[PDB]
Paper text:
RyRs are calcium-activated calcium channels critical to excitation/contraction coupling in heart and skeletal muscle. Ca2+, ATP, and caffeine are well-characterized activators of RyR, synergistically activating the channel by inducing a rotation of its activation core and pore opening. We use cryo-EM single-particle snapshots of ryanodine receptor type 1 (RyR1) to exemplify the discovery process facilitated, and the new insights revealed by our approach. Broadly speaking, conformational changes along CC1 involve the cytoplasmic shell, the activation core, and the pore; those along CC2 involve only the cytoplasmic shell.
In qualitative agreement with the experimentally estimated association probabilities, the binding interactions become favorable from state 3 (“S3”) onward, becoming most probable at the FINISH conformation. In the absence of an associating Ca2+, the energy of a transition from S1 → S6 increases, corroborating the experimentally determined trend in Fig. 1a. Notably, the energetically uphill motions of opening the Ca2+-binding pocket in the –ligand state cannot be captured by brute-force targeted MD simulations, when only the START and FINISH conformations are provided. Information from at least six structures along the functional route on the energy landscapes was needed to identify a thermally accessible pathway by MD-based piecewise free-energy simulations (see “Methods”).
Numbering used by the authors: 1 to 107
């Protein structure tokens, strides 16, 4: 389940397509919680490609639904990232993950 909440600036037209190494200023967030991951912290905005299931389904589906420049806001469900599994110490099981996603991509 990917619900997109776009902060309006962007272009609306340049979608990431298959195998395209696209660049995201993501800034993760726990629901009723603090941050857990941020490409703004590492300052390398995570040049990942579409269609290899590198990222979760809550963020891979969110990337194609966004275009260049767009600043959406994800709400990833439990069953797309870590609901059944849960990461030890970081993201528990049954977790509804939150993201500040801005798509200033390449390719």
């Amino acid at each position: 389940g990917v619900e997109i909440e776009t902060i309006s600036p962007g272009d609306g037209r340049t979608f990431p397509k298959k195998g395209q190494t696209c660049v995201v200023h993501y800034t993760g967030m726990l629901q009723n919680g603090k941050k857990f991951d941020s490409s703004r912290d590492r300052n390398k905005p995570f040049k990942f490609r579409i269609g290899k299931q590198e990222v979760i389904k809550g963020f891979e589906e969110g990337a194609a639904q966004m275009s260049l420049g767009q600043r959406a806001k994800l709400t990833c469900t439990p069953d797309v990232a870590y609901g059944a599994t849960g990461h030890p110490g970081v993201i528990p099981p049954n977790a509804t993950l939150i993201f500040d996603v801005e798509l200033l991509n390449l390719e």
